[PDB]
Design a protein around this ligand. Structure first.
Ligand SMILES: OC[C@H]1O[C@@H](O[C@H]2[C@H](O)[C@@H](O)[C@H](O[C@H]3[C@H](O)CNO[C@@H]3CO)O[C@@H]2CO)[C@H](O)[C@@H](O)[C@@H]1O
Ligand SMILES: [Ca+2]
Ligand SMILES: [Cl-]
Length: 510
């Protein structure tokens, strides 16, 4: 049996953990103790707040219908109330104590009806679509005009602020996203926006929508560009006007950060608060992309390693991204580096991502690594996305390991501290205290399909630790179970065994 050493230092690399890394798009079981919630994805592009209609685009035969009301548990009378998909979502946020992120429309049009499929000959402008206008430039109506050809976005923000107060209030909607995957508009939403979005286009639309939002609620955080994946990060999925605008910039990311900075300077307020991406791993194992299906042993191994692509300079995943564009990986430092250069101080969010294996120990383990990684790499907000319907048991386990490990919503600490391991392949470990030094939290996991290892911990810091309790989940139980205590710790050293495919949250006490 293998021995690994883990050195934890409470003095070293102390840094605040944004709680909004514990976030989601769809609510999961309801005991994960999320801190942030997002209403976003393909369906929100064409969502019309006046009648709650929306359009599926390429996901379901370009159907305009009441899917958001029905998926959101709304009765028909509720579906008829302006704003209801969104107010029902935000009401949930308030009950749960979460941050709300609410997507706003920017592709150009929103669903005028719920009659179903919109054919290629009915693409916008057509009786099937209402036109989006950022600034109404007229007195606002809490009950919008349902009979014209327009939906006013600043009017909807005023509706939210009238009902909830401004974002700086306790009950206010705090974040707004600038549509969703705009480099896929022409693919996902051809009936709305059939041409490939341009780089400049995207900037002008972002600036104009940010301005009308901020004129209503100067406290709201505005998130953009909500890029789907690397092809968009690189060149906005071959934008037509790229070669002409690219100049010195190394990728579209720099171009958007910089141009967002410039327009903000000219306006005299920050117009981009958060740099927003989605990240669905292209990582492969046994012929299978990890996001598509659970897969074989090799798929499951590749799922458990993939989170290293986020942070680890030494790691080369099997994917086209790592093959042709390795210079842009690991991806969080790379995005950080662009932010630092082109728009200092902009926050970073991963607003829709998933590692697959939703009901496999490999997905629970992947996620438990990822949550530790996001926390200590200056990510402000992150929001899981369900690629599979029904329950996502091991994803849910991962959150609960960090946020409700004992059934009493006890959590990881708010302060990352240095934690190192001698084996980055078979193990990962993430340490935290609270800003109360009494408790040291350690999430540790064994990624091996075969071999336990004994973890030899050495702790440095202000304090001496007497004992601890342990909680975990593994391949046979997705529910977190209390595990064997560490009844005595000699000289800030102790060994605990970590069976294969197991994740533990250890709480050491003084
Ligand atoms: O399958 C039933 C419903 O699908 C709805 O569309 C969803 C797609 O199923 C889903 O793949 C898509 O996920 C995207 C995400 O929106 C943005 N990032 O990438 C993910 C993977 O491509 O999300 C869609 C909902 O937004 C469809 O709208 C319904 O009509 C169907 O009933
Ligand atoms: Ca209208
Ligand atoms: Cl995109």
């Amino acid at each position: 049996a293998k021995t690994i050493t883990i050195k934890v230092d409470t003095f070293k690399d102390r840094k605040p953990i944004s709680p909004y890394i514990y976030g989601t798009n769809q609510d999961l079981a309801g005991d994960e103790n999320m801190a942030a919630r997002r209403l976003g994805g393909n369906r929100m592009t064409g969502y019309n707040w006046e009648n709650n209609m929306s359009n599926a685009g390429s996901d379901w035969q370009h159907s305009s219908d009441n899917y958001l009301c029905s998926n959101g548990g709304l009765t028909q009378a509720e579906c008829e109330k302006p704003g209801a998909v969104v107010t029902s979502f935000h009401d949930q946020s308030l009950k749960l104590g979460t941050y709300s992120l609410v997507t706003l429309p920017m592709a150009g049009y929103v669903a005028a009806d719920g009659n179903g499929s919109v054919q290629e000959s009915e693409a916008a402008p057509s009786a099937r679509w209402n036109q989006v206008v950022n600034a109404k430039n007229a007195p606002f109506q809490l009950q919008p005009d349902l009979n014209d050809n327009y939906v006013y976005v600043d009017e909807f923000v005023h509706f939210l602020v009238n009902k909830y107060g401004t974002a700086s209030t306790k009950a206010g909607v705090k974040g707004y996203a600038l549509d969703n995957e705009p480099a896929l508009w022409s693919h996902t939403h051809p009936r709305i926006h059939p041409e490939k979005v341009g780089a400049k286009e995207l900037v002008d639309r972002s600036v104009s929508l940010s301005k009308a939002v901020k004129a209503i609620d100067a406290g709201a955080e505005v998130f953009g560009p909500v890029l789907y994946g690397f092809g968009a990060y690189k060149d906005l999925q071959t934008a037509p006007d790229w070669d002409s605008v690219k100049g010195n910039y190394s990728w579209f990311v720099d171009y958007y950060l910089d141009q967002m900075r410039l327009s903000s300077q000219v306006e005299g307020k920050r117009l981009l608060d958060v740099f927003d991406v989605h990240w669905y791993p292209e990582a492969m194992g046994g012929g299978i992309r990890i996001t598509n299906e659970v897969g074989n042993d090799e798929t499951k191994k590749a799922r458990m390693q993939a989170p290293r692509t986020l942070w680890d300079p030494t790691y080369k995943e099997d994917s086209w991204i790592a093959q042709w564009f390795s210079e842009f990986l690991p991806i969080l430092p790379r995005l950080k580096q662009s932010v630092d250069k082109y728009y200092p101080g902009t926050k970073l969010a991963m607003t829709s991502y998933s590692y697959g294996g939703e009901n496999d120990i490999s997905g629970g383990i992947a996620m438990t690594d990822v949550l530790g990684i996001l926390g200590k790499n200056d990510v402000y907000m992150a929001n899981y996305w369900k690629l599979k319907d029904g329950v996502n048991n091991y994803v849910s386990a991962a959150y609960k390991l960090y946020r409700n490990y004992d059934g009493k919503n006890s959590t990881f600490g708010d302060t990352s501290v240095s934690a190192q391991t001698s084996d980055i392949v078979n193990s990962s470990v993430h340490a935290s205290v609270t800003n109360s030094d009494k408790e040291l939290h350690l999430v540790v996991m064994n990624k091996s399909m075969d071999s336990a290892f004994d973890a030899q911990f050495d702790l440095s810091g202000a304090k001496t630790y007497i004992s601890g309790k342990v909680w975990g989940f593994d391949k046979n139980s997705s529910q977190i179970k209390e595990a064997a205590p560490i009844t005595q710790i000699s000289g800030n050293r102790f060994t605990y065994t970590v069976p294969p495919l197991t994740a533990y949250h250890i709480v050491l006490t003084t």
